[PDB]
């Protein structure tokens, strides 16, 4: 129906105009690639997000159970944002951060601004102050659930934690868009996904442990799964798997191999992984180990995956 196709295009454009880009997409669409994004530390996840990383100037939510990897994911966003010359902040109401781990996976913890605020509103106001400066590239709020309202802490009104977020998220959303600063809210499952946060966030990611990685006999890490349940920057509902190795973090090299074979850029002659006629290793671990020992080939593979895809 040629007469229908135009009407459909028109309707889509009218929606796209009056509510902003990404208000409607076909799930098979290619993503519109931004100038800069914050890579996540896994290329598989970067591809699931469409735009190759987390968007700038937007509210991001990352949630999952305890021991899920959601904080690891947020810490890689901090590492990479820093690695590109950015400044980072970490508003903490959990008191759980491990800086040694943070450092190993790549965070410049010395330069990391940290705040341990007294109330939930103090946390968001301080976040807003930092954002409105224009000097921050990323701010992580850990976590939504821990943000206790002042009235409740002072003894003095029941569901005003929801009223608190709504108020602040409206104010914060404008501040983030102007500054180009990404705000990451970490949230726990067992509030569930915020309430206001669920609707203000441009990207929502659901993070979970799938299975224990076998280090011969002992556990060296976890296979992690992430579904992008909400995505205003690129078609949603895509998922990715990657490895989080204890003490090291997300195995970048492991994820290059996974997306490597997925995209045909890496072939398999039996248990051997092959790239460009050369061999990477027998089994996944040798191939992974090879790529960390050979940064140049890992970057070449990373380059070729991005190019074959959107970016």
Swiss-Prot record:
<dbReference type="InterPro" id="IPR003593">
    <property type="entry name" value="AAA+_ATPase"/>
</dbReference>
<dbReference type="InterPro" id="IPR027417">
    <property type="entry name" value="P-loop_NTPase"/>
</dbReference>
<dbReference type="InterPro" id="IPR006142">
    <property type="entry name" value="INTEIN"/>
</dbReference>
<dbReference type="InterPro" id="IPR020587">
    <property type="entry name" value="RecA_monomer-monomer_interface"/>
</dbReference>
<dbReference type="InterPro" id="IPR020588">
    <property type="entry name" value="RecA_ATP-bd"/>
</dbReference>
<dbReference type="InterPro" id="IPR049428">
    <property type="entry name" value="RecA-like_N"/>
</dbReference>
<dbReference type="Pfam" id="PF14528">
    <property type="entry name" value="LAGLIDADG_3"/>
</dbReference>
<dbReference type="InterPro" id="IPR006141">
    <property type="entry name" value="Intein_N"/>
</dbReference>
<dbReference type="Pfam" id="PF21096">
    <property type="entry name" value="RecA_C"/>
</dbReference>
<dbReference type="InterPro" id="IPR013765">
    <property type="entry name" value="DNA_recomb/repair_RecA"/>
</dbReference>
<dbReference type="InterPro" id="IPR049261">
    <property type="entry name" value="RecA-like_C"/>
</dbReference>
<dbReference type="InterPro" id="IPR023400">
    <property type="entry name" value="RecA_C_sf"/>
</dbReference>
<comment type="similarity">
    <text>Belongs to the RecA family.</text>
</comment>
<dbReference type="Pfam" id="PF14890">
    <property type="entry name" value="Intein_splicing"/>
</dbReference>
<dbReference type="InterPro" id="IPR003586">
    <property type="entry name" value="Hint_dom_C"/>
</dbReference>
<dbReference type="InterPro" id="IPR004860">
    <property type="entry name" value="LAGLIDADG_dom"/>
</dbReference>
<dbReference type="InterPro" id="IPR036844">
    <property type="entry name" value="Hint_dom_sf"/>
</dbReference>
<comment type="function">
    <text>PI-MtuI is an endonuclease.</text>
</comment>
<comment type="function">
    <text>Can catalyze the hydrolysis of ATP in the presence of single-stranded DNA, the ATP-dependent uptake of single-stranded DNA by duplex DNA, and the ATP-dependent hybridization of homologous single-stranded DNAs. It interacts with LexA causing its activation and leading to its autocatalytic cleavage.</text>
</comment>
<dbReference type="InterPro" id="IPR030934">
    <property type="entry name" value="Intein_C"/>
</dbReference>
<dbReference type="Pfam" id="PF00154">
    <property type="entry name" value="RecA"/>
</dbReference>
<dbReference type="InterPro" id="IPR027434">
    <property type="entry name" value="Homing_endonucl"/>
</dbReference>
<feature type="binding site">
    <location>
        <begin position="64"/>
        <end position="71"/>
    </location>
    <ligand>
        <name>ATP</name>
    </ligand>
</feature>
<protein>
    <recommendedName>
        <fullName>Protein RecA</fullName>
    </recommendedName>
</protein>
<dbReference type="InterPro" id="IPR004042">
    <property type="entry name" value="Intein_endonuc_central"/>
</dbReference>
<dbReference type="InterPro" id="IPR003587">
    <property type="entry name" value="Hint_dom_N"/>
</dbReference>
<dbReference type="InterPro" id="IPR020584">
    <property type="entry name" value="DNA_recomb/repair_RecA_CS"/>
</dbReference>
């Amino acid at each position: 129906t040629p007469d229908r196709e135009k009407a459909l295009e028109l309707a889509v454009a009218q929606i796209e105009k009056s509510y902003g880009k990404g208000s409607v997409m076909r799930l098979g669409d290619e993503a519109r690639q931004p100038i800069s994004v914050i890579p996540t530390g896994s290329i598989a996840l970067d591809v699931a997000l469409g735009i190759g990383g987390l968007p700038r100037g937007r509210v991001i939510e990352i949630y999952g159970p305890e021991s899920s990897g959601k904080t690891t994911v947020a810490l890689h966003a901090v590492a990479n944002a820093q690695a590109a010359g950015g400044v980072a902040a970490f508003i903490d109401a959990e008191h759980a951060l491990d800086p040694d781990y943070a450092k190993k996976l790549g965070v410049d913890t010395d330069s990391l601004l940290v705040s341990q605020p007294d109330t939930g509103e103090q946390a968001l106001e301080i976040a807003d102050m930092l954002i409105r400066s224009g000097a921050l590239d990323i701010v992580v709020i850990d976590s939504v659930a821990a943000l206790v309202p002042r009235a409740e802490l002072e003894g003095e009104h029941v569901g005003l934690q929801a009223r608190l977020m709504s108020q602040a998220l409206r104010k914060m959303t404008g501040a983030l868009n102007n500054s180009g600063t990404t705000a990451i809210f970490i949230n726990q499952l067992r509030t569930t996904g915020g309430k206001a946060l669920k609707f203000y966030a441009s990207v929502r990611m659901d993070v979970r442990r799938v299975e224990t990685l076998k280090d011969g006999t002992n556990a060296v890490g976890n296979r992690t799964r992430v579904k992008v349940v909400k995505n205003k920057c690129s078609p949603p509902f895509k998922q990715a798997e990657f490895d989080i190795l204890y003490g090291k973090g997300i195995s970048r090299e492991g994820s290059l191999i996974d997306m490597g074979v997925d995209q045909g850029l890496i072939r398999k002659s039996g248990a051997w992984f092959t790239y460009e006629g050369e061999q990477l290793g027998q089994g996944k671990e040798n191939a992974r180990n090879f790529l960390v020992e050979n940064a140049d080939v890992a970057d070449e593979i990373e380059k070729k995956i991005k190019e074959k895809l959107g970016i």
